Structures are given as C-alpha cells and as structure tokens.
Design an enzyme around this catalytic site. Structure first.
Site, PDB file in Angstrom:
ATOM      1  CE  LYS A  10      40.880  67.347  58.669  1.00 23.91           C
ATOM      2  NZ  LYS A  10      41.451  67.775  59.978  1.00 23.91           N
ATOM      3  CG  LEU A 104      41.136  74.070  56.403  1.00 24.72           C
ATOM      4  CD1 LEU A 104      40.728  75.068  55.329  1.00 24.72           C
ATOM      5  CD2 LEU A 104      40.032  73.903  57.436  1.00 24.72           C
ATOM      6  N   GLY A 105      42.832  69.478  55.980  1.00 26.85           N
ATOM      7  CA  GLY A 105      42.874  68.195  55.302  1.00 26.85           C
ATOM      8  C   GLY A 105      42.794  68.263  53.794  1.00 26.85           C
ATOM      9  N   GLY A 107      45.234  68.126  51.271  1.00 32.65           N
ATOM     10  CA  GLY A 107      45.937  67.046  50.598  1.00 32.65           C
ATOM     11  C   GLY A 107      45.262  65.704  50.799  1.00 32.65           C
ATOM     12  CB  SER A 108      43.899  64.009  53.797  1.00 38.76           C
ATOM     13  OG  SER A 108      45.125  63.802  54.472  1.00 38.76           O
ATOM     14  CG  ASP A 141      43.989  64.010  58.051  1.00 38.86           C
ATOM     15  OD1 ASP A 141      44.411  65.182  57.930  1.00 38.86           O
ATOM     16  OD2 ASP A 141      44.289  63.289  59.025  1.00 38.86           O
TER      17      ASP A 141
END
Ligand SMILES: Nc1ncnc2c1ncn2[C@@H]1O[C@H](COP(=O)(O)OP(=O)(O)O)[C@@H](O)[C@H]1O
Ligand SMILES: Nc1nc(=O)[nH]cc1C#CCNS(=O)(=O)C1CC1
EC number: 2.7.1.148
Length: 283
Positions: A10, A104-105, A107-108, A141
C-alpha cells in the site's frame, strides 16, 4: 490442495496527523491505495489443528510473525463461537518480495491476507466487519487490507471510506536504512495539529506526508533518495518511511527513470490498484 494468495503493498498517497489520543496513538487523515505488487502466500490445509509458518521471515520469530499471530487470532475467535471445524490447521509459506518495515505495510498486508484466506478456507463465515475488527488488534494498517479497496481513512486508519484515485504508475525506492515507526511518531517536532479537512478539500490540495519532514531531517539516506527522485517526478514518503515513491502517468516513463536509478535506490515499478489484488483474487 495448495492455494496461493496475493499480499499487495500500500501507499499513503497523503497523510496528515490531526492529533494524538490518550492511548499514545495518533489520529490522522490519509488516503490508502494498493500496488499490483507484493508477497505471495500459499496455504496447505492441515487436519491436526496446528499452524506452521514453514518459510521463516528474516528477523522475526515464528510466534512473533504477523502471519502466525493472525492465524491464531482467527482460530481463537472462531473456536470461541463454534465456527472452527474440528482439526482446522494449516501449513503456510510466503514468497516475500516486499521489504520488511519500509512503510509499504507488508507485514500488515500479510496478516490481512491470512485472515481473509483462512476465513474462506476454514469456512469460518466471519464477515468483513469482524475480520477488519480483529485486524485492528494486530495493527492499524491491517483493516484497509482486509476491506480491499482504496480508501480515505481517518481515526487511526480504521475509519475507511472507499474512493477511487487515479491508478498512476509508481517507482518505489527503499533507502538503505531501517526506520522504527516509534521514532517518527515519538518525535516532538512531528506535526500533530494539522486541521481536519474534507475529502474534497484534500483531493484538490497538494498531496503531502506530515512525517516526511522528520524522516528527511533525521535519516540522510531518506534525504538522498528523495532529492534524487524529485528531479524526475513528484516524490513523497509513504507511511513513516523509509520507502519513497514518485508518480508517473505511464509505465514507460516510470521504467525509464528506474533504468537510470543507481542501485542504492533499491527501486521497483508497479501500477496502482484501487481494488486489492487479494480481493480481486477472491472473485
Ligand atoms: N510476515 C511479516 N513480514 C514483515 N514484517 C513482519 C511480519 N511479521 C511481523 N513483522 C514485523 O513488522 C515489522 C515490519 O513492518 P512492515 O509492516 O513490514 O513495514 P511497515 O509497517 O513499516 O510498512 C518488523 O518489526 C517485524 O517484526
Ligand atoms: N495512528 C498511529 N499512531 C501511532 O502512534 N502509530 C501508528 C499509527 C498508525 C496507523 C495506520 N497506518 S498508516 O500507514 O496510515 C500510518 C503508520 C503510517
């Protein structure tokens, strides 16, 4: 059988810090858009009730990994309401293309993909709201990835309003430094007074990221990459760093600029997507 599931990245197309609640978190006004690009998660169903992340992620212990934490959170919630078929288990591996901890998110996004995938594979029958509700416990996130659409997000990022920004092409560069999100958010000079504005006002004002000034001022690696990209296109920080992106109208322009990029940019090109590749893959 083995199923493959996308785990897209993202971008915070803009990001403004409007305050800080009592629990230490900050209230923001931001705009999430996905990238047709990211990790790939494969799940093989188990019948013995175990959860195993087979491929390790560098620097993360098994039980600390968001993949496993999201899997066990789902397991517990479903079993606590009789929605977990007996012996539900899973083997989980991940082909990781995204950097660990760059705004960049990744892990989320990995947690959201596991929740939506195992919810379908175990037939838990949980809803978008429930999944996004559980995801919030894992990270702010996570909800945006669970719901699967580009959105204007408020509160701490969980109050999402679907919106369709232009799907530009992006050169995404990773400076060679690790920025703990706590450092930026605990900085005194960080703006926490940006006034709450309407979507239409935000969609015509110039996009910016309130954390960029601190990240730029404290990490010369982030300053280096930003100064380079700004010579070619509008470039901003995403999340709290360290990653940076520049907007391009076409794929050729973006890839041309990436052909010229020195290797210390650690850059790739990817198209923006208003519909998450994960949800695109669930139809
Ligand atoms: N599967 C995973 N992939 C990446 N990071 C993970 C994972 N599981 C847990 N983490 C944790 O999240 C951090 C990486 O943050 P990440 O969400 O990838 O980037 P950001 O949130 O800065 O965009 C690390 O501190 C790591 O311990
Ligand atoms: N609201 C927050 N307060 C904190 O103290 N820590 C983290 C927060 C968050 C968030 C949602 N994701 S995000 O990408 O928009 C932003 C992290 C860059």
């Amino acid at each position: 059988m083995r199923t493959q599931w996308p785990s897209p990245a993202k971008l915070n197309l803009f990001l403004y810090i409007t305050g800080q609640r009592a629990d230490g978190y900050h209230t923001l006004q931001t705009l999430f858009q996905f990238l047709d690009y990211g990790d790939t998660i494969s799940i093989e169903l188990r019948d013995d009730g175990d959860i195993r992340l087979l491929t390790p992620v560098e620097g993360v212990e098994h039980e600390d990994n968001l993949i496993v934490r999201a899997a066990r959170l789902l397991m517990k919630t479903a079993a606590d309401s009789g929605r977990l078929p007996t012996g539900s288990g899973a083997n989980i591996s991940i082909d990781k293309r995204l950097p660990v901890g760059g705004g960049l998110g990744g892990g989320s996004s990995n947690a959201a993909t596991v929740l939506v995938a195992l919810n379908h594979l175990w037939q838990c029958g949980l809803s978008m709201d429930e999944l996004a509700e559980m995801g919030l416990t894992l990270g702010a996130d996570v909800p945006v990835f669970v719901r699967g659409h580009a959105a204007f997000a408020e509160g701490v990022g969980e109050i999402l309003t679907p919106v369709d920004p232009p799907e530009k092409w992006y050169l995404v560069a990773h400076p060679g430094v690790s920025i703990p999100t706590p450092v930026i958010f605990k900085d005194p000079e960080l703006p926490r007074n940006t006034p709450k504005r309407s979507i239409e006002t935000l969609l015509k004002c110039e996009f910016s990221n309130d954390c960029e000034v601190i990240a730029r001022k404290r990490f010369r690696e982030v300053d280096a990459v930003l100064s380079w990209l700004l010579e070619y296109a509008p470039s901003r920080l995403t999340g709290t760093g360290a990653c940076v992106f520049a907007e391009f109208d076409t794929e050729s322009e973006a890839r041309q600029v990436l052909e010229q990029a020195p290797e210390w940019l650690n850059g790739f090109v990817a198209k923006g997507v208003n519909l998450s590749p994960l949800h695109r893959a669930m139809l």
